């Protein structure tokens, strides 16, 4: 393992070959889950662009966040998407914190500590546990198959998810910076592979 | 009883099918109430809907808190209906409170804990004590006949009614949290039967 | 699978307008809807678009010349061009947004603006 505490993975130039693959341990397919992650880049105002890529062999886009220019953030699973708009964006390094429940179907969606009003999104259905999570490409295949024009120039850190819903006491805290217990990826406790020009460095951010 | 404390119901999806019916000790017919409550919605920028819907055997409108895009709160008793503007509207939950007095027919809107002007409406009249309180859809026939586009999608809570005027100090110190002794419909010591797609979750706002 | 149906096509001259739309078997209420032209030789080009929440987009070269508009109560979009010219000219497709690697597409309607 590594931990990654006040450092970050740095994507400076756009190309399709550079990214970073996650691993996590999990074996039990998922019925509810959350990630927070907290990155910084300027494309918002020029194109869109994948944040997560979490892609499973039976569906390219088993979990997804997207930018979309002059939409705002998408949130896609098992290939439908939902949409939260965003009518102006600002420029410097945000915070996020998504969650989703099969039981009910409800999505939470969190930015800068300020909550966004619920929505119901593909009841009952389950994710596939093996999967490839991928940071820096989109991904239209397992693994592969990346777009130039869907990369991400930047930076990225402080990855972490559960699996399963946390109370907004709980994403507060996570906000403040406290203590935390991540249960599928660990940004304390971290597995990686890098392809490509990608570099380590302290983050911006405080 | 049920002890709703932290929590709030949730409407996610738009439906003429989902809403919450609440039941009252109510005896006696009343000659000045108060109500106040916490939502959290975005419809406000696309259409109308109703938030409180009060309804009588003799009149499907006897009290009614709705929303009227490009215009702003209508505070409707007794068939007849009051407007409060709002050039612009936040996207943010925000916490309401309304009272309605019968021998002066005085009325007091407050949003945030900022008074609205006065104004007078429906004077000398009474309300009838047999009634029914639905959140979620709008009643246009004594517990029935609802409108999908007048219903309502996100949260809803803290939902509490007075029969008697509040003084400022008063409403001031239920926004900020303090104690209190609701009479007619106390959110600690509700009841209330469910119908549809609708959810009990924790609050999202402080 | 949203059953697009569009229409309101067919031969105008320069200097007209037309109000063409189209309707889906399905709710409307989430999905935004949009429209592509492809002139003869080229590929399909984005024109506009219009969000769940009622935000538009518009492509550069229609700026203010097309508008469209939305109706969740019949599940219903229509897109209205004025001031038509030739070179507007083109095979116009149906939009159904989806993830966003892909996209619903409609049959197309041709539109042939003359001199």
């Known amino acids: 393992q590594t931990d990654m505490s006040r450092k970050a993975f740095v994507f400076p130039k756009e190309s399709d070959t550079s990214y970073v693959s996650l691993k996590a341990p999990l074996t039990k397919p998922l019925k509810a889950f959350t990630v927070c992650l907290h990155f910084y880049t300027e494309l918002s105002s020029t194109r869109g662009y994948s944040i997560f890529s979490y892609a499973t062999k039976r569906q390219d886009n088993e979990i997804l966040i997207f930018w979309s220019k002059d939409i705002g953030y998408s949130f896609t699973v098992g290939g439908s998407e939902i949409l939260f708009e965003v009518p102006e964006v600002t420029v410097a390094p945000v915070h996020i914190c998504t969650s989703w429940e099969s039981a009910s179907g409800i999505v939470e969606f969190w930015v800068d500590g300020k909550p966004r009003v619920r929505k119901s999104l593909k009841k009952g259905y389950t994710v596939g546990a093996e999967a490839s999570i991928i940071l820096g490409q989109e991904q239209d295949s397992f693994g592969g198959n990346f777009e130039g024009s869907q990369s991400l120039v930047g930076d990225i850190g402080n990855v972490n998810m559960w699996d399963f819903v946390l109370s907004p006491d709980e994403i507060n805290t996570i906000y403040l910076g406290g203590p935390f217990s991540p249960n599928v990826l660990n940004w304390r406790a971290l597995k990686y592979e890098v392809q490509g020009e990608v570099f380590t460095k302290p983050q911006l951010w405080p | 009883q049920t002890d709703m404390s932290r929590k709030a119901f949730v409407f996610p999806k738009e439906s003429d099918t989902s809403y919450v019916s609440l039941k009252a000790p109510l005896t006696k017919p009343l000659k000045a109430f108060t109500v106040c409550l916490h939502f959290y919605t975005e419809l406000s920028s696309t259409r109308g809907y109703s938030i409180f819907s009060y309804a009588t055997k003799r009149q499907d409108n006897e009290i009614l808190i709705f929303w009227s895009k490009d215009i702003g709160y209508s505070f409707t008793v007794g068939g007849s209906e009051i407007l409060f503007e709002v050039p612009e509207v936040t996207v943010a939950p925000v916490h309401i409170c309304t009272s309605w007095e019968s021998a002066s027919g005085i009325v007091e809107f407050w949003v945030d804990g900022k008074p609205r002007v006065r104004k007078s409406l429906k004077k000398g009249y009474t309300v009838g004590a047999e009634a029914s309180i639905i959140l979620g859809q709008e009643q246009d026939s004594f517990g029935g006949n609802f409108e999908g586009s007048q219903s309502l999608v996100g949260d809803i809570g803290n939902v509490n009614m007075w029969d008697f005027v509040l003084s400022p100090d008063e409403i001031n110190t239920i926004y900020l949290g303090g104690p209190f002794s609701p009479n007619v419909l106390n959110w600690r010591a509700l009841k209330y039967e469910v119908q549809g797609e609708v959810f009990t979750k924790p609050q999202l706002w402080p | 699978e949203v059953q697009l149906v569009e229409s309101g096509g067919g031969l105008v001259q320069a200097g007209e307008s037309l109000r063409l739309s189209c309707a889906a078997s399905?709710?409307?209420?989430?999905?935004?809807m949009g429209w592509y032209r492809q002139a003869p030789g080229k590929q399909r080009e984005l024109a506009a678009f219009?969000?769940?929440?009622?935000?538009?987009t518009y492509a550069d070269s229609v700026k203010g010349r097309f508008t469209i508009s939305r109706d969740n109560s019949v599940n219903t979009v229509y897109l209205q061009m004025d001031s038509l010219k030739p070179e507007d000219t083109a095979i116009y497709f149906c939009?159904?947004?989806?993830?966003?690697?892909?996209?619903?597409w409609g049959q197309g309607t041709q539109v042939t603006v003359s001199s």
């Open positions: 219009i969000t769940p929440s009622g935000r538009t």
């Open positions: 399905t709710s409307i209420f989430d999905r935004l």
């Open positions: 939009y159904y947004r989806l993830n966003p690697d892909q996209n619903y």
